[PDB]
Amino acid sequence: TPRNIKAARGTTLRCKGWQQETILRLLENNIENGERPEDLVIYMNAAKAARDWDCFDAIVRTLKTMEADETLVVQSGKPVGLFRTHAFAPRVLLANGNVAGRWAGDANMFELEKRGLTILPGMTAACWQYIGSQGIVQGTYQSFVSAAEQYFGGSLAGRIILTAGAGGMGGAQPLAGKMAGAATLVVDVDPVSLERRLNTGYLDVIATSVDDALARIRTLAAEREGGSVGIVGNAADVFEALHRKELRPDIVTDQCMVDPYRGYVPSGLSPAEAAQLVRTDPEQALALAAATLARHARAMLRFRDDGAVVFEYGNTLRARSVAAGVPEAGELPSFVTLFIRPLFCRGIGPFRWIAASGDPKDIAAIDGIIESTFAEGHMIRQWIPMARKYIQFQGLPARIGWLGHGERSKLALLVNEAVADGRISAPIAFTRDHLDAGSVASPYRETEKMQDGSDAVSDWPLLNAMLACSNGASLVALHSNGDKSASAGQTAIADGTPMAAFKLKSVLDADTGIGVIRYADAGYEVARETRALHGLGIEIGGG
Amino acid sequence: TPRNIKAARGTTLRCKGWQQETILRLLENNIENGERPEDLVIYMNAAKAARDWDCFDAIVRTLKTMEADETLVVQSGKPVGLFRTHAFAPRVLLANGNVAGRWAGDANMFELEKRGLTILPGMTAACWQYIGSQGIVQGTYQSFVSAAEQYFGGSLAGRIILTAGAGGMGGAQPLAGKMAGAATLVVDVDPVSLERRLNTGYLDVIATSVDDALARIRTLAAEREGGSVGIVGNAADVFEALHRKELRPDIVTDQCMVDPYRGYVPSGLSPAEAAQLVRTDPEQALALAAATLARHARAMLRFRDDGAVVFEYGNTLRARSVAAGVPEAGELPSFVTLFIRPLFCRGIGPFRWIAASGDPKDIAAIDGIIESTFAEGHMIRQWIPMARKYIQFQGLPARIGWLGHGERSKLALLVNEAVADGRISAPIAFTRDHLDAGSVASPYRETEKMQDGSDAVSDWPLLNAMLACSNGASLVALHSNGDKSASAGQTAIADGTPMAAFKLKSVLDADTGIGVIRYADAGYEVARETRALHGLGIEIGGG
Numbered sequence A, B: 001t002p003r004n005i006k007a008a009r010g011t012t013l014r015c016k017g018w019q020q021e022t023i024l025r026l027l028e029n030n031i032e033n034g035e036r037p038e039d040l041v042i043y044m045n046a047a048k049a050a051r052d053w054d055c056f057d058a059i060v061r062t063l064k065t066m067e068a069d070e071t072l073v074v075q076s077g078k079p080v081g082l083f084r085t086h087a088f089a090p091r092v093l094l095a096n097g098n099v100a101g102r103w104a105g106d107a108n109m110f111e112l113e114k115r116g117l118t119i120l121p122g123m124t125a126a127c128w129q130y131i132g133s134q135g136i137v138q139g140t141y142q143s144f145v146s147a148a149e150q151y152f153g154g155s156l157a158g159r160i161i162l163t164a165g166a167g168g169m170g171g172a173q174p175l176a177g178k179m180a181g182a183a184t185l186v187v188d189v190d191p192v193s194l195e196r197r198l199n200t201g202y203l204d205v206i207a208t209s210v211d212d213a214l215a216r217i218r219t220l221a222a223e224r225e226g227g228s229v230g231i232v233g234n235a236a237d238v239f240e241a242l243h244r245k246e247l248r249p250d251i252v253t254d255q256c257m258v259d260p261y262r263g264y265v266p267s268g269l270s271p272a273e274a275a276q277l278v279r280t281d282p283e284q285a286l287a288l289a290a291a292t293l294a295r296h297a298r299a300m301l302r303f304r305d306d307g308a309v310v311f312e313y314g315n316t317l318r319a320r321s322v323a324a325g326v327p328e329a330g331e332l333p334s335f336v337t338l339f340i341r342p343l344f345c346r347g348i349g350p351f352r353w354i355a356a357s358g359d360p361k362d363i364a365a366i367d368g369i370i371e372s373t374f375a376e377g378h379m380i381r382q383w384i385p386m387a388r389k390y391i392q393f394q395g396l397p398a399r400i401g402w403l404g405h406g407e408r409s410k411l412a413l414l415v416n417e418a419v420a421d422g423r424i425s426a427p428i429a430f431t432r433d434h435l436d437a438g439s440v441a442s443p444y445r446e447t448e449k450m451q452d453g454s455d456a457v458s459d460w461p462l463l464n465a466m467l468a469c470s471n472g473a474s475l476v477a478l479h480s481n482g483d484k485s486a487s488a489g490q491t492a493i494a495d496g497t498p499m500a501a502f503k504l505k506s507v508l509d510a511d512t513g514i515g516v517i518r519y520a521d522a523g524y525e526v527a528r529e530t531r532a533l534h535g536l537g538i539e540i541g542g543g
């Protein structure tokens, strides 16, 4: 018998107070929007909201009975203690997925998870900050727009984007590409993944074959219209076929789950046969997945040699391809270094907010505060109309709205006032992905090729989490992805009170502040000037 | 021209308040007691108080001007930002030495430190919690006493302890062994190290040769008296010679710095020639250091085959010896699993406190509160007279006093009252090593062979640091030692105020609480009962 978790709607408390209730609803919202919610899996195949259902039930009970001056402590998805702290402390502290680095290799991480000692935490899966496919779509859209500005004269009309991966997060690629004007073709081996994008508005059409997809993409390109087409098939086989048939894409990227232990499908298997092979014969699953990934990466490089702009989109494809024997895949650029890093230098990152009421009018109210607040032509003034027009709510109504240093606390204080005075019906939860300037160390991705070589320095997310606790964030998390990266998340709730006014301002300005500091420290001049302008620095002699 | 840093004494503020002043004095005290203070090196050859002297000068300026509701942020020894937080937040957040695990190997850590991107933080070096050789001496003493209880009928009279390593931390072995009744022989390659122990009261006599050392040790053993003798020589050569000459030690351990990049001396070189070889030809320095370490480990194993109790004392000798080609060294037990783990199950760990005044009467006052507070026969009632009789103050007067869950906050509240009412002249700083139940993940040491296999799970120190911030610790740090371990430190200051009363109780009970939780989670029955008794648990079904 299925759980079918849904977040509570409306304005009735089941907990002792709105801070606790909002976090409960965020946890419930994660599972409501998850890719495999009956396994607690939220996205990327195995990133979970809780270690297991008994752990989930205990977390829920504790949120319903904890006081506003108590702090629940969660360890890799498992509630482990409830401490009396104080009103200005967080209500929940989480550390998920962290393993000392020498033993945090891929094989040992898989063993530890299989024995119940750890979970794959993702970024927003295990600390309850997921808002469905919307959470990533602004960054995927921004990446395509910036590609268009840098390499295609500022327009994707008539241009073709080819990608793979229509999962919980990759599912935003087809919509991102359509919004940016491109004829967008997404490959996924699982027809269920395409149907789920088709039903949530993220995909327009599912093709019946490669030939059919080719025809529909050429039509969109010839009309110079944005639209998206899905193909069912393995990226390795389909990318090869698309080259034989002369697709000639302008952009090629990929957002499959390429982890051979967790959801990469070898050529000729289904998702279920692959999961079963990992269970019964992992050495053969690994060999088969590497052979498919090698072809997959070679197909992208073949497009790159014909003239396509090929980049990695944050799924570790390059490093895993190099390990599977494609050394040239290590030479591919990344969306971060081509498009996102100059935004991080200004503290601009995937800020986001969730209506705890479940009422879409609460989001439309905040979209309205944004249009009265931010200058015309600002990034956010261009984005909110796109979101309004193209993005269907999933679970609790929520909005991705990238904003930068000082802008996040400005918006959150105006929302907190709007909660206090009745324009918004219930608290708003502010959070963000961990793909942000001051909250992640990740040499394969966010911090690849730092100007000063500090790629792997992970002091920075630890400081980000310690500041969030010290500033009164409602919920703070520290996550790792094996031995490859470390990140910090935090949630801060606008409940209309003055206490929340103080917290929203302290937390969010320090959250973007430490990111600006981090990039100024690396030597990025735009960050150094932002740091100086906002008084974020410390004067050190002998410079 | 040398800095010659000394902590300020007396009751005059140079900062805006006693929280800031106490932390300034702790930072100054670290360098005053450091093994190489003109290089900012505190102990283990390269663990530093600050990234460099310019960083140190900026930290000092900021401590003198920051307000009581501001938080200084330090990144691997470098001040990087000053944030407005609140009165109940920490005054200093530090993250030192952390590198994402895939790139945190020994060779890359050495490169990153050489380029100024990171520091070796030790545990108490980079977050200003060091009290000279006293910080480790209770744990070294406790280890010898427990060895005596388990293997020698409860007495070391007439017994011989052989060890190596008379550095800042290894220097406590000769005194620990003497206090426990043994004839204790310590080998060190550097006569300066022995002279410094001889001058601070940690070593009785320096031998002039192996033959001389042998004679003085046999005399102490025959009188059945405790005493210590130092030999100048390389452990590899001296341990071999001691076996040829038939020392027949009862206990053999080692506390050299065995890191070949940082202070392990190959056989036939001096400390200076070795440091120079690392600089000019590190591949040969590594080869020579491994050959010496192999012999060093084989000499210990030869004693073990004659019948000595041989254990590792926390310096990574086993793992580095296995890497140097001695696989049998991996089979040696460790002081943690033989002697310390049952203390961690009760939350008992290296708690410690420092008189900010610099006045020894403030320590004697707290020694007196302890003798009126703790039942006769309690561990601490046996230790304080030993400390009083054998331990010379270094720098600011300070006391190591291992205590367990609820005992630490009990003592700290009584001290805070004694500060409020004049028995103690100025604030007392409470802190601890990071070798503690809830504050370190370390498979080679503190968490080797956890009953449930969770050795490498490092969620726990991250939670320890997040709780310390949320509970108002004065100073919180997160440290790593390469890819091998992660730890959390915190300092909480008894300044006589009610605000400090609240903080001391919240911080310290959560600091020991999370350690008890951590061991109960692993299945240790004494910890599970402590967790139940103090209401630290969370009920989870399907158990």
Ligand SMILES: NC(=O)c1ccc[n+]([C@@H]2O[C@H](COP(=O)([O-])OP(=O)(O)OC[C@H]3O[C@@H](n4cnc5c(N)ncnc54)[C@H](O)[C@@H]3O)[C@@H](O)[C@H]2O)c1
Pocket (backbone or CB within 6 Å): A035, A043, A044, A045, A046, A136, A139, A164, A165, A166, A167, A168, A169, A170, A171, A187, A188, A189, A190, A193, A233, A234, A235, A236, A255, A256, A257, A258, A263, A264, A265, A266, A267, A271, A292, A313, A314, A315, A316, A435
């Ligand atoms: N770029 C970013 O900022 C960003 C954001 C979130 C997710 N990610 C990464 O994106 C990846 C995907 O995440 P997700 O949540 O969408 O994962 P998911 O598990 O929900 O979806 C992965 C999809 O890949 C498909 N797939 C697997 N092997 C395939 C193959 N050989 N050919 C074709 N399709 C194949 C599966 O059918 C599935 O639909 C992960 O690596 C995740 O870490 C990055």
Ligand SMILES: NC(=O)c1ccc[n+]([C@@H]2O[C@H](COP(=O)([O-])OP(=O)(O)OC[C@H]3O[C@@H](n4cnc5c(N)ncnc54)[C@H](O)[C@@H]3O)[C@@H](O)[C@H]2O)c1
Pocket (backbone or CB within 6 Å): B035, B043, B044, B045, B046, B136, B139, B164, B165, B166, B167, B168, B169, B170, B171, B187, B188, B189, B190, B193, B233, B234, B235, B236, B255, B256, B257, B258, B263, B264, B265, B266, B267, B271, B292, B313, B314, B315, B316, B435
């Ligand atoms: N067991 C514990 O709880 C504990 C506590 C603190 C320190 N430590 C560890 O103890 C070790 C020593 O720390 P420290 O602060 O004393 O270091 P240190 O650098 O101050 O002293 C190391 C000493 O080793 C000597 N030495 C080096 N190579 C030698 C050789 N081949 N033969 C003989 N002597 C040799 C040096 O002369 C030096 O005096 C480190 O690994 C540190 O991490 C463990």
Ligand SMILES: O=C(O)CC[C@H]1N=CNC1=O
Pocket (backbone or CB within 6 Å): A044, A122, A123, A124, A125, A314, A433, A434, A435, A445, A481, A485
């Ligand atoms: O942590 C990671 O590197 C992968 C998952 C994460 N990436 C983008 N968004 C997410 O939550």
Ligand SMILES: O=C(O)CC[C@H]1N=CNC1=O
Pocket (backbone or CB within 6 Å): B044, B122, B123, B124, B125, B314, B433, B434, B435, B445, B481, B485
């Ligand atoms: O962090 C480590 O493993 C070594 C240094 C540390 N050991 C004991 N005491 C200390 O401060």
